[PDB]
């Protein structure tokens, strides 16, 4: 099974870079809007705790350098909204496409465009995780960086990334400039909370595998919702809701297992291991599809 | 680590979809030429053992439908090139970037932009096997779909889909229409060759481990090229070359580990498995990373 992400092209010509002072970073550069994190405006020094009301008082429209490659901008309104800086400039963007600010839940996924000062430079999919970080591994020198979804023309902006987490995970906003979890943008005492296996990705995934090829963890057990969530507790997995198993409905009609005959196979791959079998050649269970990406792609 | 596709912008206007009676597949738009496989003059019971020339010969400029998106086109000169059909149409694509055709050697990465009736819908990064297949997984009804590489503003093609072979694994050809690989546009008895594992990007992802934080794995055995192919023999790996080495100078000098001492690391996890423990967050040894896809994300 091949990890997909979406195609970055409604999104690479939203990217600009925004320089201010001795910081450069992305943007987001949508009608005649630009986009970026907030932390722009702090001097390094600055990031162990910062007065951002007080640090944008100082800073005026000729303290922000707005590069959409060869065009440099110019910033006629500088504001701030939430944990974002809003600049107001002169020109619209004529490859805007037709977009949507959503704010993604935990267990979902996007495909993130990676850039580094302004240009983009790679792409790959990944996973809103229980404990609100993302594990992109390196998101580094990549601050402004953009989150998305597409359906068919409109894109679906969810993230923008912010911070690297002294334990290696990212941290990060929605458009609005409002960020998943409890995290700030500063410098200081951050702790991740203990991340869970995303449960109904795993049922996605093993749902996968039986459309590809691999039957063999499947099993004439059954096991209901009660039962399972009490080893998913055990094994530091989320709970299963009745909502869940709705959102499998579809890839259980498909396949021929139920739901529950699904849980009651994974039941198992936890308890009795998996003995260096590999479910589509991996050894371990992937939590970063959801039905809707296995859908989509079979 | 993340494995990281280029972004496909470039590409995704290039895009067009070849329909031919009843076959419908992926197009690439370059100025006034559409390329696609030539599998598409092919009616399903042609697909056993086709006549191509005679084929062809009853093919008329208007039996191709090129479509690039709402916009139709027009063929105003069919020809055959090895594998390929070049269709060349009367308007250039206004959309079409500074492109190259590249013949890629096996070991060597790409990123696939697979494409469904002419409209792109997903983005990843794959590598071109040792007996000249991609695990692809799924380019199925994708065929036309292109594999690139990008180096600033220049495109470089040099992948296109045509087959998914009886042991779901991908066959397909060059830009200039020959196969990699034995294989033919022919539905037939079609073997792939004992796959081998990519020994240089087992190093190079090895190698980026340790720039991450990975270190258990290394230890003070050393060992020459000799000795590392007697045992890469063994565990059905490819032989290492000095030319591998040469390639690998940049990275071993980064981390500080001579690149024999990281073969005597490797050499070592073959002979006494892993344990359960992770390099990178994965279970077993990964080999789809190139040196210069370590470096270019580092």
Same mark, same amino acid.
């Given at each position: 099974? !091949?990890?997909?992400?979406?195609?970055?092209?409604?999104?690479?010509?939203? *990217? =600009?870079?925004?320089?201010?002072?001795?910081? &450069?970073?992305?943007?987001?550069?949508?009608?005649?809007?630009?986009?970026?994190?907030?932390?722009?405006?702090?001097?390094?020094?600055?990031?162990?705790?910062?007065? #951002?009301?007080?640090? $944008? +008082?100082?800073?005026?429209?000729?303290?922000?350098?707005? @590069?959409?490659?060869?065009? @440099?901008? /110019? %910033?006629?309104?500088?504001?701030? @909204?939430?944990?974002?800086?809003?600049?107001?400039?002169?020109?619209?963007?004529?490859?805007?496409?037709? #977009?949507?600010? =959503? !704010?993604?839940?935990?267990?979902?996924?996007?495909?993130?465009?990676?850039?580094?000062?302004?240009?983009?430079?790679? %792409?790959?999919?990944?996973?809103? /995780?229980?404990?609100?970080?993302?594990?992109?591994?390196? $998101?580094?020198?990549?601050?402004?960086?953009?989150?998305?979804?597409?359906?068919?023309?409109?894109?679906?902006?969810?993230? *923008?990334?912010?911070?690297?987490?002294?334990?290696?995970?990212?941290?990060?906003?929605?458009?609005?400039?409002?960020?998943?979890?409890?995290?700030?943008?500063?410098?200081?005492?951050?702790?991740?909370?203990?991340?869970?296996?995303?449960?109904?990705?795993?049922?996605?995934?093993?749902?996968?595998?039986?459309?590809?090829?691999? !039957?063999?963890?499947?099993?004439?057990?059954?096991?209901?919702?009660?039962?399972?969530?009490?080893?998913?507790?055990?094994?530091? #997995?989320?709970?299963?809701?009745?909502?869940?198993?709705?959102?499998?409905?579809?890839?259980?009609? @498909?396949?021929?297992?139920?739901?529950?005959?699904?849980?009651?196979?994974?039941?198992?791959?936890?308890?009795?291991?998996?003995?260096? !079998?590999? +479910?589509?050649?991996?050894?371990?269970?992937?939590?970063?599809? &959801?039905?809707?990406? %296995?859908?989509?792609?079979?």
């Amino acid at each position: 099974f !091949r990890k997909m992400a979406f195609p970055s092209g409604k999104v690479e010509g939203c *990217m =600009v870079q925004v320089t201010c002072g001795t910081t &450069t970073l992305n943007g987001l550069w949508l009608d005649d809007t630009v986009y970026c994190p907030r932390h722009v405006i702090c001097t390094a020094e600055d990031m162990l705790n910062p007065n #951002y009301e007080d640090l $944008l +008082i100082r800073k005026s429209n000729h303290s922000f350098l707005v @590069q959409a490659g060869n065009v @440099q901008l /110019r %910033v006629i309104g500088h504001s701030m @909204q939430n944990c974002l800086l809003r600049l107001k400039v002169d020109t619209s963007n004529p490859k805007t496409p037709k #977009y949507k600010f =959503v !704010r993604i839940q935990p267990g979902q996924t996007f495909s993130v465009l990676a850039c580094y000062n302004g240009s983009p430079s790679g %792409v790959y999919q990944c996973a809103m /995780r229980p404990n609100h970080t993302i594990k992109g591994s390196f $998101l580094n020198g990549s601050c402004g960086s953009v989150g998305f979804n597409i359906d068919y023309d409109c894109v679906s902006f969810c993230y *923008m990334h912010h911070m690297e987490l002294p334990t290696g995970v990212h941290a990060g906003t929605d458009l609005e400039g409002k960020f998943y979890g409890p995290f700030v943008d500063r410098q200081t005492a951050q702790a991740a909370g203990t991340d869970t296996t995303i449960t109904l990705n795993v049922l996605a995934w093993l749902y996968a595998a039986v459309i590809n090829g691999d !039957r063999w963890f499947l099993n004439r057990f059954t096991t209901t919702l009660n039962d399972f969530n009490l080893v998913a507790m055990k094994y530091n #997995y989320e709970p299963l809701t009745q909502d869940h198993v709705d959102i499998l409905g579809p890839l259980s009609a @498909q396949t021929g297992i139920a739901v529950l005959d699904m849980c009651a196979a994974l039941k198992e791959l936890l308890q009795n291991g998996m003995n260096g !079998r590999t +479910i589509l050649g991996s050894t371990i269970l992937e939590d970063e599809f &959801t039905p809707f990406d %296995v859908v989509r792609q079979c």
